[PDB]
């Protein structure tokens, strides 16, 4: 993809890790039954006041090499285009052509 779009994902993922611990502690606080009713809504209000990119929902995992937003594989982390190239050269361990 474009160079800006790759870098935009980096700064979109920088916030996710920066508020990673805050969300986890906040998430239990708003879901805690023993927490007071006014305690939990105030905390949930803060969750909606955090920076927008901080959530792990705006993350679109992307190919490491080319930055292709489509055809992504979690096991390999590469798009479909570059995974085929590396598999067929033999650079991906274990993976081979299948036939049954």
């Amino acid at each position: 993809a474009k160079k800006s779009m790759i870098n935009r994902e980096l700064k979109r993922e920088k916030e996710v890790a920066k508020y990673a611990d805050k969300r986890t502690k906040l998430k239990e606080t708003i879901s805690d039954m023993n927490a007071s009713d006014e305690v939990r809504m105030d905390a949930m209000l803060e969750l909606q006041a955090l920076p927008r990119n901080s959530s792990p929902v705006r993350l679109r995992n992307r190919c490491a090499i080319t930055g292709r937003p489509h055809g992504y594989f979690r096991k390999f982390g590469l798009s479909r285009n570059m995974l085929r190239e590396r598999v067929m050269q033999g650079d991906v361990p274990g993976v081979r052509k299948a036939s049954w």
């Binding site: 809504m41 949930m44 209000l45 909606q48 006041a49």
Partner: protein, 78 residues
């Protein structure tokens, strides 16, 4: 629509804006781009202008519009 346990959603930058309008009881349009917010009973009677994508269409809040999103009344397509 939305879980009732999580409460009615209202934007942070809109809840304060309507709260400040209650004190003065002003009738001037309130310019907002957040049409995802729910309509509360505290904002009945005041006038605010929701983004339609191009401009800010003015909407006069009535009693029978509490419980809807602000975007209900800001058509986007023609």
């Amino acid at each position: 629509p939305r879980s009732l346990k999580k409460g009615p959603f209202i934007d942070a930058h809109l809840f304060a804006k309507v709260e400040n309008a209650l004190e003065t009881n002003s009738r001037k349009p309130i310019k907002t781009w957040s049409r995802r917010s729910m309509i509360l009973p505290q904002m009945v009677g005041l006038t605010l202008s929701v983004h339609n994508g191009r401009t800010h269409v003015p909407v006069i809040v009535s009693e029978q519009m509490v419980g809807h999103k602000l975007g209900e009344f800001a058509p986007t397509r023609t």
